Amino acid sequence: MRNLKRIVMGENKLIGLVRTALDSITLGQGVNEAKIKSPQSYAFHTISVGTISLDICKAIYSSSEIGRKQLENLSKKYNMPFEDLWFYGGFLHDWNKLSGKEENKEELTKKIIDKLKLPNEFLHGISTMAEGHLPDNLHLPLWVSIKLADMLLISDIGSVRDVFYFANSDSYRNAIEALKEYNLELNYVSSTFRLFTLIASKELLNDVFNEKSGYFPLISYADGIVFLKRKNSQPVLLSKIVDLLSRQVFSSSSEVIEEKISDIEKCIKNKEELFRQMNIDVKSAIYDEEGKVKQINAFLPTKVCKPFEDVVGNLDNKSKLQVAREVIERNRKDIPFGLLIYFVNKFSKNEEDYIRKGLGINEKSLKYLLNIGDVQKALDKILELLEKRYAEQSSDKTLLYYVKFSSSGNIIDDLPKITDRPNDYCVVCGMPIYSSNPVRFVQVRDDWKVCPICIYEANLMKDRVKPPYFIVTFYPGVPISLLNIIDFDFSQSSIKYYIDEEKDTYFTAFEKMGGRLEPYVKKVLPAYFSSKVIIKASEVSNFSLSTRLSKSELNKLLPYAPMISMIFLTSPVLISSNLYEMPIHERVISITSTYNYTFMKSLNSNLLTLYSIFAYSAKYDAMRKICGRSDLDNCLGYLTEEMDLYSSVDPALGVLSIGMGVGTPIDTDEKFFSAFLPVSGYLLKVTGKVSKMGETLKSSIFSIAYALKDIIKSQKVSKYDVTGFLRDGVDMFFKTTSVIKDKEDRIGISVNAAISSLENKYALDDQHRAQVYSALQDIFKTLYSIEEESDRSLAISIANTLSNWLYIAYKLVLQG
């Protein structure tokens, strides 16, 4: 548990509200699945309702003088801070409506209002405002904000336009008519998800839809963002949208541009003595003493000289000019002839572009031209070349805001499409290319070309958004004022997986998973318009992750999947190598990848699904201690092959999956005592609740282990002593003469053979052996049911798994 004072650092007023609400609800209480229609958790829905209600109230406060003084009176009546009244009002309101599911049992609401330290007179209004009408007229702002937040988050409104259809037709009309009187309109802007939009969407909410201009963004729904419009405010204009988003492309990094400058200096340095000597006696330098004339590759070594239009062709048009002039200003005083020969002769496909003072001479021209002052003519022809390409690539950007960024509540400043005869179409994305230069040199049929868009996406995937990715989507949408708040920090903890359903609250388990609430989120990439958020895997684990997604390295990123889910308020998580891999839809959340193992199946509740993978995190934390740096990949494969097989008959056997057949070293003392003991009590705890079989197995193994240390009152046991009497029962249960027996006889003979081999080594009691005999029945009863289902060749492997777990529980009950 972190310092309870240091978490409060950077206290945004919204952060403390979300902290307090999560600190009030039980972990297993907010993780609970909300409704059957879509995957929603109690924690995600209720926090979202309070967050949107807080935003709408602050919008009314900032937009209307009458709503401001109305909120002041409403705040003074209950004697609560303004934003505390607005947030907790919608938070308690949503818990009062989601509790309509079968349990009524409204008694839970009293615990929340108590830990929040709030007057119950406030709850008397909410419990009559969730159902019923206004307490009085002064509660109108809360009635508007909360009913709108309740509307915006129905199980699957699913679309931005569905909000405006639910708006006027259904009972939500009364709230919007009052929102009209607070001079606040509703509005929305639809957008398509794209890689460059992922990094650039944050700047739109700051330089376009900011509070200064009066737009107040609320929530997004994978097909657009929903915000507001205070009356008589300026319309949303596409001119500034294109002005800002094209700037994010036409602003190459200040050190990437320094590298492209160094790529030029790498070539002109290789023959520095010749370029320096060319300041006098050019005819002695250009001609070779044995013959006529030298060619330029003797001065411009091909191994080190990349042509300029290929060097800086990766950047934008304005950045090419800064490269040329910075290289010119840096090296003109030393080797001005190397700069001349480089640009004149190494310009790649547009080779002949230097007609200014272009004598047409192939190589002798250096003797037949004027001095260094002529170099500036190249800078002029660079200005006349890049500024013209600038107008063409800015037009290549515009169509994204004519076709994709569409279906909006904004107006178009842009001149229409027809810059007639588009030179080409992009070969991968399809956007029309108009600039004359681009060719597909990314690093029956003639030539293919690419647009300046998806080359900027490549320069982002090279470092800033390099795969793989953790992806978590929200249903039906997610508040924007909450996306730019949630963060995480795994650098000090790595994996953590210990959670209790009720011993700690949601926020305790939230911070235990490494979740952070900060005013400026830095480890998280919120795809705002997409109602989803993407986590770069490099900021999750320090492993040298590949560019695709290997099935052997999915076993390494998976221990972080449930943590990411809980940090984002129990939401479905997808591990993928590409951002555009679309999610598959149940009332419970799902943790998935491109290829799903069986142990990643979603059990009947979000709490059990999290425990299912948290059990794998505990096993991964033990194999981390056992297998070496090179054996771990082979170790996790043998484990995963068993878990995927055991969970194919029951998930409780997937929790008990460890191996213990052969595979990687069968040596038990090297495996149990070294790593698995500190997590055994947790794996058994998960087993006893994921299925009725696991509850039968957990209670039976402990009832034997408790009786084992009660009979064997000494620590003098061997590995064969506590497991031998059970192995003699398993051998009796699986030899072909007994396999034919009837069900009641096959289990009865095997348990008799088990206790018979036990009583020959140690003395039992008449009243004490009955619990061992009764537990052995339930064990072999399950071994028969997992033989009816599945195979004898697997039931034996499960029996060896259970036989070793008895040794584990015996060492576990002595730990105290």
Binding site: R2, D500, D504
Partner: protein
């Protein structure tokens, strides 16, 4: 040495659960206020206070996870509402 220095060492003990047991001994004693002593305890369960001849010993406990508790006991003395800490003990116990 003041609580500003001791807090930098305690933040490490509270965050990292790998520290199974740590024993601190001071000479001279670390001086803390009654307020800083209350803030280090307000969330823990007190279990025992015994008044030695000149050293009052008090112990506390936090619940971390599952059945693992972080226990913590003090040896200190008070004068003019100032708290001088003789030694500090932290250890994590499996409690049924």
């Amino acid at each position: 040495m003041n609580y500003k220095e001791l807090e930098k060492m305690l933040d490490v003990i509270f965050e990292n659960s790998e520290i199974k047991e740590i024993d601190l001994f001071f000479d001279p004693e670390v001086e803390i206020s009654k307020q800083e002593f209350e803030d280090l305890v307000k969330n823990a369960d007190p279990l025992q206070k015994v008044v030695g001849d000149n050293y009052i010993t008090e112990t506390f406990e936090w619940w971390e996870f599952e059945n693992q508790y972080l226990e913590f006991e003090l040896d200190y003395y008070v004068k003019d509402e100032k708290i001088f800490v003789l030694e500090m003990h932290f250890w994590r116990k499996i409690r049924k």
